[PDB]
Coordinates of C-alpha atoms in Angstrom, one line a residue:
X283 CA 99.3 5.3 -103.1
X284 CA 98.8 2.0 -101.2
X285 CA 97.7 0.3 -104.7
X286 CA 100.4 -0.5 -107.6
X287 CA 101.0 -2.0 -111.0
X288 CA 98.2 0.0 -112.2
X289 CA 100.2 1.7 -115.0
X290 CA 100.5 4.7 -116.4
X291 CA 98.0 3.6 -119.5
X292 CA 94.3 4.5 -119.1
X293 CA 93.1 0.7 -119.3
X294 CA 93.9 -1.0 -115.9
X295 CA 92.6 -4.7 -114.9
X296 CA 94.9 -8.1 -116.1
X297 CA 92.8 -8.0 -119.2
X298 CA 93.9 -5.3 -121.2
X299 CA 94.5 -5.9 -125.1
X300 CA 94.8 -3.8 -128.7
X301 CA 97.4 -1.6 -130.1
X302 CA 98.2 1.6 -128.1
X303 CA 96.1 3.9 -130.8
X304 CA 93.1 1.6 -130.5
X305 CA 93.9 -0.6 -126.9
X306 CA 90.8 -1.9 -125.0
X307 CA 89.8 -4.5 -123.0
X308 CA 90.6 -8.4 -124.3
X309 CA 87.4 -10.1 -125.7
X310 CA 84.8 -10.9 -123.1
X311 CA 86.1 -7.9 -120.9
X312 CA 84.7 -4.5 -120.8
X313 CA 85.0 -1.3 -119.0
X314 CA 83.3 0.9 -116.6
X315 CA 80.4 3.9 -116.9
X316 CA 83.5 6.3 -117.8
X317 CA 86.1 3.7 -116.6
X318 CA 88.6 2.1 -118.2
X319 CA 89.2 -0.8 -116.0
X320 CA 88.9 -4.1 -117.5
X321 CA 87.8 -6.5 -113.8
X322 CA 83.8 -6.6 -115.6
X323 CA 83.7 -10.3 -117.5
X324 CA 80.7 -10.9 -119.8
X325 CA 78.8 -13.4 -119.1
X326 CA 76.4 -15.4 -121.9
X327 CA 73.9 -16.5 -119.3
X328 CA 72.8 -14.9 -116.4
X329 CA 74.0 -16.3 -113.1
X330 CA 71.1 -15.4 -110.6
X331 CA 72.2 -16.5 -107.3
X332 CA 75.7 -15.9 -108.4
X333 CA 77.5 -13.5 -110.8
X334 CA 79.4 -13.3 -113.8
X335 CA 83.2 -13.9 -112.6
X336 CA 84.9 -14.9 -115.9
X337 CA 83.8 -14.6 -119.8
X338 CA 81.3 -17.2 -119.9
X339 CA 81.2 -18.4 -116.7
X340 CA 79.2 -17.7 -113.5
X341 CA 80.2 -18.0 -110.0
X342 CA 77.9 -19.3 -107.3
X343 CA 77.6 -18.1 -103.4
X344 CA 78.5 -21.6 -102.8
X345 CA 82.3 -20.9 -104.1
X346 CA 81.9 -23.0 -107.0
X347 CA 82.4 -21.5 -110.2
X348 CA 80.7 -22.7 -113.9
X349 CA 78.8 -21.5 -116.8
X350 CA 75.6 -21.2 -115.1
X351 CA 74.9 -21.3 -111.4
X352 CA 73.7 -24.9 -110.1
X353 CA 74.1 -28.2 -108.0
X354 CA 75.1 -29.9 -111.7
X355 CA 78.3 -30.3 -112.5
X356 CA 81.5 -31.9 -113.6
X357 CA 83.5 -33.5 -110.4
X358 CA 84.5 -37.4 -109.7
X359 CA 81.0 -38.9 -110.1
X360 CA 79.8 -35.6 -112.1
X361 CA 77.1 -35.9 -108.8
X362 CA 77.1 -35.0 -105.1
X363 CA 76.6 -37.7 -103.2
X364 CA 76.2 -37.2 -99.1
X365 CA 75.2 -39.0 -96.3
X366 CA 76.8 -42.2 -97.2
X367 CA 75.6 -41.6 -100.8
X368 CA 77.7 -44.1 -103.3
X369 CA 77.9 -43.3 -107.1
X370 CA 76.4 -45.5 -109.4
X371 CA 76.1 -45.0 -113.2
X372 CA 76.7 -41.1 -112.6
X373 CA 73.9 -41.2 -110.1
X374 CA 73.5 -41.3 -106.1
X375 CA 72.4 -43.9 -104.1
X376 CA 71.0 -42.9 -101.1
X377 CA 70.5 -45.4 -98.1
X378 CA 67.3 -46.2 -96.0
X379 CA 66.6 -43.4 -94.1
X380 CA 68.1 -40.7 -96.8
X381 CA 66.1 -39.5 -99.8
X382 CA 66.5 -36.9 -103.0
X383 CA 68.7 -36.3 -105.6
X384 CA 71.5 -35.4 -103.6
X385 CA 71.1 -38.3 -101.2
X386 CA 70.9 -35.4 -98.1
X387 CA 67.3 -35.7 -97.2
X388 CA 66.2 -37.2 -94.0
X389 CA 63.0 -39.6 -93.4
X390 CA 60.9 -39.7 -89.8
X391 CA 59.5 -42.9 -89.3
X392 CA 57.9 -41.7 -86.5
X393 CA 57.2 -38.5 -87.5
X394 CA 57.0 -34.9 -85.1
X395 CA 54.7 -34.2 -82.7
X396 CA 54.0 -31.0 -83.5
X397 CA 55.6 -28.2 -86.1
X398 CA 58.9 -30.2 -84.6
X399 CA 61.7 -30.7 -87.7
X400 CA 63.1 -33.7 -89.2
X401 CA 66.7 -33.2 -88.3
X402 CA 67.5 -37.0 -88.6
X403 CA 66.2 -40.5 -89.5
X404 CA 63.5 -41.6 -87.3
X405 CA 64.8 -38.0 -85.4
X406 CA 62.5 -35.0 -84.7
X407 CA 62.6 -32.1 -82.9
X408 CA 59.8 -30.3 -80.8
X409 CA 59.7 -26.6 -81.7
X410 CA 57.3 -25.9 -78.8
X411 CA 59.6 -28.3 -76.5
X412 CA 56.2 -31.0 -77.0
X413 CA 56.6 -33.6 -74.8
X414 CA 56.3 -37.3 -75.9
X415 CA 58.6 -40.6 -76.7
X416 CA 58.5 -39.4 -80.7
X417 CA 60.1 -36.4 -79.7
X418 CA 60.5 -34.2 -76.5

């Protein structure tokens, strides 16, 4: 009996509501095939990539928590802004060298040599170790 707290009422969970004859879970909380435990939140939309942690509101892999999964969202600048990214009439300015929405995207002046990857600004690297000043 490691676990406690649980009760000796059918309905578990911290969301348990109603009168003893007719108790249930509170609004936006259900129960189990069978169960009576009230830890399953409805969720409006569907969160994809994430899942339905409250009533309402979806929870991303990321950690962040809203009522849909997504980069948008309301925090300081209401943006993310990255790689010296400045906010500027709730937008990101990116810097030469940085591109997209998010300000995170690097640009290679000088390209790869090969199937190398744009790690950096004017920096590339060789996938099949391609020689060369560009990358190598």
């Amino acid at each position: 009996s490691a676990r406690g707290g649980g009760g000796h009422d059918a309905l578990k969970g911290p969301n348990v509501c109603g009168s003893r004859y007719n108790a249930y879970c509170c609004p936006g909380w259900k129960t189990l095939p069978g169960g009576n435990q009230c830890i399953v939140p409805i969720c409006r939309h569907s969160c994809g990539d994430g899942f339905c942690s409250r009533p309402n509101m979806c929870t991303c892999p990321s950690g962040q928590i809203a009522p849909s999964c997504g980069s948008r969202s309301i925090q300081h600048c209401n943006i993310r802004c990255m790689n010296g990214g400045s906010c500027s009439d709730d937008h990101c300015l990116c810097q030469k060298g940085y591109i997209g929405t998010h300000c995170g995207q690097p640009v290679c002046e000088s390209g790869c040599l090969n199937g190398g990857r744009c790690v950096a600004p004017n920096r590339c690297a060789c996938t099949y170790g391609f020689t060369g000043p560009q990358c190598e």
